[PDB]
RNA sequence: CGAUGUCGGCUCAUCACAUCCUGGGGCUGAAGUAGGUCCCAAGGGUAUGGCUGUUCGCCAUUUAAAGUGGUACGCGAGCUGGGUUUAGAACGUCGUGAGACAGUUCGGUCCCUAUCUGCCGUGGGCGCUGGAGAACUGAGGGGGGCUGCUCCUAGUACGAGAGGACCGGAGUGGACGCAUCACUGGUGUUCGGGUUGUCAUGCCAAUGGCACUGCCCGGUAGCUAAAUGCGGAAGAGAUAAGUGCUGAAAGCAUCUAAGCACGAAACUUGCCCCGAGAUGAGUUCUCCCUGACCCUUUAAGGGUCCUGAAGGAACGUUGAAGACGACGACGUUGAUAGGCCGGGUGUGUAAGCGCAGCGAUGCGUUGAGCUAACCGGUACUAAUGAACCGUGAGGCUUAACCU
RNA sequence: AAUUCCUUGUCGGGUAAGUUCCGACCUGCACGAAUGGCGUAAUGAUGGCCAGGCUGUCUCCACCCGAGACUCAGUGAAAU
RNA sequence: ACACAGGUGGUCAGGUAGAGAAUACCAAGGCGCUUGAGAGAACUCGGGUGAAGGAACUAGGCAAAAUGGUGCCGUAACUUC
RNA sequence: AGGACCGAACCGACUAAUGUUGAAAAAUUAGCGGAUGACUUGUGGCUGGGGGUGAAAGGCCAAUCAAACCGGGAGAUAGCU
């Protein structure tokens, strides 16, 4: 339950460290991204020399979030802090190379497998 | 806020048309005393289905 | 085809075998018996009425008993019809029990909804409140604006103000029969019916496709 | 909208209303039978009984728990010496509401609430 | 709610053993991967336990490789395939979640042990 | 001009179609994809933000699309009061000056308990022609109609290649609506616990009052949403633009004049709800009432006695029903409410006593004690015998039967 | 610029995006030296802008506690 | 104008905690505010709490939330020192 | 020491909400400024209407102020209603 102006960590080495939510994509007057929901975001804090700069605009996939995932069984799984991995902005796939903490079975997709090749949890 | 024009009298008895008092309708006689109360209630004399209660 | 009467017993859950959790209504249909039978020869239409559950001796009065005793049937709870479908035959007496969904994969479940009384705007038409603070003057919850001005200089009907929601009969449709239970006399609907527990339901067939 | 909540307000506060049924209910064990109002009857029957149930069984314990509620030491007395293996077969309906008419103050329908015993 | 009662009980598993809050729980959940049916592994504090009779969840917070996890777990799903009790814990409350707030040093629950 | 409050924002709409999207179609300088342009179409849908008082606009990022207008440039007895436009003050400029400038800047009171219409709900009376209890048909009225993306068909058709379909089907989203509480949660001043200050219960121990529930930590039921189910459809009929078939007037041609077939989210139905005050007051089933006697200005007239049915109403215990009425359940041949019993749930291992410790404390008895609205039972308490209302066979005419 | 109409001047900074804000330029419509010019530490219930924290302001409201509102008894207005 | 939530000078000033005449709870002493009983709708007022987000609200962080004590460490530009 | 700092009494009145046929013809509640001074307050006195007084607002001068209140000229005058 990430929405625009959501200050979400990032997953992968890209180069950011904190970034911001500025729209949610997938629809009109869509509220929340979530799961595996794709966003656009900006950059508000970087590593000195990352492949991404501060103030930059591109799309990023939701990897954990605090309000967390349900399970068809009724389980959740709650993370503590939301984060993202920063995916390319025209053609997908994402910008870094390692992906920091767990993900979840949800970004089991055609795509996202890359973020799921590495990624050492779930 | 308030009236444009002043209601009538008929307007101002068609309104009370539903004050009205509904009677008792009948109060109940008592078992034992026989005498009159409220149903569900105690007697005057402090009576209640035919048996002796608070008797102050 | 006809459907039967039913009453809300609560919900639960049914955990599948490959782990699904499943949020089911149970529903216990008993043995749904009908008490007259419609004709065109005399009513106009083809419809059965049933009825189900049980009544107090003490409690049913001597018109309701004598539709029951001419039917030949216990007194129940209630009264329903079931409009029929040009090729179903049924006699007064005969006995309907849950088993009749043993094949129906899907009904729709109709319910008289719970009773919040009256209710304003925002939980009853779903508007937006105005603001909480800079400035609002005693209108947070209040509806606004109800109309335009000279032109039309009335409200015009069905305007969304608030009076009283819920206690209506709803009709949820097209909700997944879970189980069909004819030794407990009980319908496994999957999801959420109409009304609090222990109301009267009415489960037919899904009409939709 | 209130579905299955049980427990009058009687437009009053929470510790008001618990001060007041703690009185109240000092003064049913006291006296036996009280006039009060109807509603106040009916909400007095649901702190008062619990009280006898209590005292149904003596230990240091029940008596210190029965005088943090009701807070006072010859109800307790009473409670656990008399009104306790007084009712001791009675299971539940340890007192009856006797509804007595209205008040002249203010119209409010009164009741007289009284212990089920007093034979004396 | 005989009914509910009885049918409720007719899904409830038998062998769920015995923990409370403190308890570092191993539970091993069935995870399917396309066609094979792996069972993976999550070891945590339990800090909360929800008891419904079949509706009985647990919450079992894991510090994993990086930032912490919270799985909800219906006890009684066939999803969840073993609890076992790794080490006893000695907590005074029923609900752990102070824990949210401490990692480390400060997160640490004493052993049981009786 | 004995006052019709004037921008903009919010809330809440509503209509038009000169249509932004979705739907149908003709021409194309239409290969496909994507377009351009024109006809038809008003069902539903039709952004979030930076700046600015701004409408507008520019910008950022979305979207199927971010329509154009009317409605006192809709909406201040619905909200705001930022702007304009009172009284204070200053700048630039004008005037000798008082002052002045839709030039600028800072500060600056927005009342109203609704009588009538309207509208949203909800009842009482009477009617419907004997009374009453139910179930209905349905005149009519309202709600609902949005849509993306992925996959298959098919990398086929088309194209030199790049690229890339029509028609048809499956899945899964967004926004919206209905229901619900099984799950995940929120609340849960009525449950349990921790703890600070102080006061009291004689005192220790234990408790209670007050300090925002003193501050907190959890939490039952209920209510709830961020939670979970479901929905918008298929189909039919009559069509719009459009496309035709046969076919003359006009021995050809021609979709039309006679005749015939297609044809869209619009129209009538299909789906959901209200619904016999539908005064055109309908239908069906069932239940109850089968006495005498006077008077007259002899009428569907009035009165007296005897009867009082079916049923309703009142009263009481009340409810996941409720502002109040209403509606639903129960009233002792009874689980309607309270209590009680058992369970569950929540909290988290009470008090007393014993042991260890100098002591705070810890350990044992002990997952203990206490547990609200929950669940299953139980007549212990309260739901009283009765009284009250409602009657006594239901008009006239005509017709068809009285087998 | 409390002063600038044209004007949201132009360039730069901050922002994903800045008619406001800061720095600069100077074509000052219509600054300017005690109706003082320009700086100015501290001060200000002063004006404008930014950031951290914090939050029901808001997304989008939900529940609860109280006082009215509703019903009963008593008294009993007002504008028009 | 009222038996009006306003205004009105001086004097005395106990306990516990506290720096204190603040504040909390109390003593002496005085009061419960001259309409009550119910119910537990919308809506208004005064409050409590709130998932994820955290100024996106808005004319503007208005309002609310937050901060908050004592001791010790430590503390920049600029400055009239 | 200080028109010094924090902060009650005391003086004030910056914001918001309520109130706006009010509890009140200017208040209440929650925050807010000053709080040894150009402070604040009691009792008395003095200044008066084109006059007073004014750390200046056209403010204040008995709920009245770009000229108080009362009485009189006075039935001012009103090509206006």
Not at chain 1, 66 to 83: E, L, Q, T, Y
Not at chain 1, 95 to 113: H, N, Q
Not at chain 4, 83 to 90: E, K, N, V
Request: glycine share 10%.
């Amino acid at each position: 339950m990430i929405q625009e102006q959501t200050m979400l960590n990032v997953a992968d080495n890209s180069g950011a460290r904190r970034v911001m939510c500025i729209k949610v994509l997938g629809g009109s007057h869509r509220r929340y991204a979530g799961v595996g929901d794709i966003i656009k975001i900006t950059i508000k804090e970087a590593i000195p020399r990352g492949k991404v700069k501060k103030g930059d605009v591109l799309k990023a996939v939701v990897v954990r979030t605090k309000k967390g995932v349900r399970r068809p069984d009724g389980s959740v799984i709650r993370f503590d802090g939301n984060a993202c991995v920063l995916l390319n902005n025209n053609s997908e796939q994402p910008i870094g190379t390692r992906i920091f903490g767990p993900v979840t079975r949800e970004l089991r997709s055609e795509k996202f497998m890359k973020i799921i090749s590495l990624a050492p949890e779930v | 806020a308030v009236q444009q024009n002043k209601p009538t009298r008929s307007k101002r008895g068609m309104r009370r048309s539903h004050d009205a008092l509904t009677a008792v309708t009948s109060l109940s006689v008592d078992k034992t005393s026989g005498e009159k109360h409220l149903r569900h209630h105690i007697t005057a004399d402090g009576y209640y289905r035919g048996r002796k209660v608070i008797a102050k | 085809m006809i459907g039967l009467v039913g009453k809300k017993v609560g919900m639960t859950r049914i955990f599948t075998e490959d782990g699904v959790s499943i949020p089911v209504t149970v529903i216990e249909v008993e043995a749904n018996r009908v008490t007259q039978v419609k004709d065109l020869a005399n009513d106009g239409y083809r419809a059965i009425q049933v009825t189900t559950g049980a009544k107090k001796a003490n409690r049913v009065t001597k018109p309701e008993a004598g539709h029951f005793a001419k039917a030949g049937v216990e007194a129940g709870r209630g009264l329903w019809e079931f409009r029929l479908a040009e090729g179903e035959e049924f006699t007064v007496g005969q006995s309907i029990s849950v088993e009749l969904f043993a094949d129906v994969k899907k009904v729709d479940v109709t319910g008289t909804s719970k009773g919040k009384g009256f209710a304003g705007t925002v939980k009853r038409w779903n508007f937006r409140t105005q603001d909480a603070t800079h400035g609002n003057s005693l209108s947070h919850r209040v509806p606004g604006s109800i109309g335009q001005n000279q032109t039309p200089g009335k409200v015009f009907k069905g305007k969304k103000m608030a009076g009283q929601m819920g206690n209506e009969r709803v009709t949820v449709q097209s909700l997944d029969v879970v189980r069909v239970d004819a030794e407990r006399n009980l319908l496994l609907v999957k999801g959420a019916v109409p009304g609090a527990t222990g109301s009267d339901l009415i489960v037919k067939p899904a009409v939709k496709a | 909208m209130r579905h299955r909540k049980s427990g009058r307000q009687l437009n009053r506060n929470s510790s008001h209303r618990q001060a007041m049924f703690r009185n109240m209910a000092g003064s049913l064990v006291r006296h036996e039978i009280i006039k009060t109002t109807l509603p106040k009857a009916k909400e007095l029957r649901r702190v008062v009984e619990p009280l006898i149930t209590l005292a149904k069984t003596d230990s240091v314990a029940n008596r210190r728990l029965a005088f943090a509620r009701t807070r006072d030491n010859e109800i307790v007395a009473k409670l656990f010496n008399e009104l306790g293996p007084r009712f001791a077969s009675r299971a539940g309906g340890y007192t009856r509401i006797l509804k007595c008419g209205f008040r002249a103050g203010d119209n409010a329908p009164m009741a007289y609430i009284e212990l089920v015993d007093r034979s004396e | 709610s005989n009914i509910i009662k009885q049918l409720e009980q007719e899904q409830m598993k038998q062998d769920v053993p015995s923990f409370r809050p403190g308890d570092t729980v191993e539970v091993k959940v069935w995870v399917v991967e396309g066609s094979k049916k792996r069972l993976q592994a999550f070891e945590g504090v339990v800090i909360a336990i929800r008891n419904r009779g079949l509706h009985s969840a647990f919450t079992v917070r894991k510090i994993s490789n990086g930032e912490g996890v919270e799985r909800v777990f219906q006890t009684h799903s066939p999803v969840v395939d073993s609890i076992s009790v790794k080490r006893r814990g000695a907590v005074r409350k029923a609900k752990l979640y102070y824990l949210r707030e401490r990692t480390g040093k400060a997160a640490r629950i004493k052993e049981r042990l009786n």
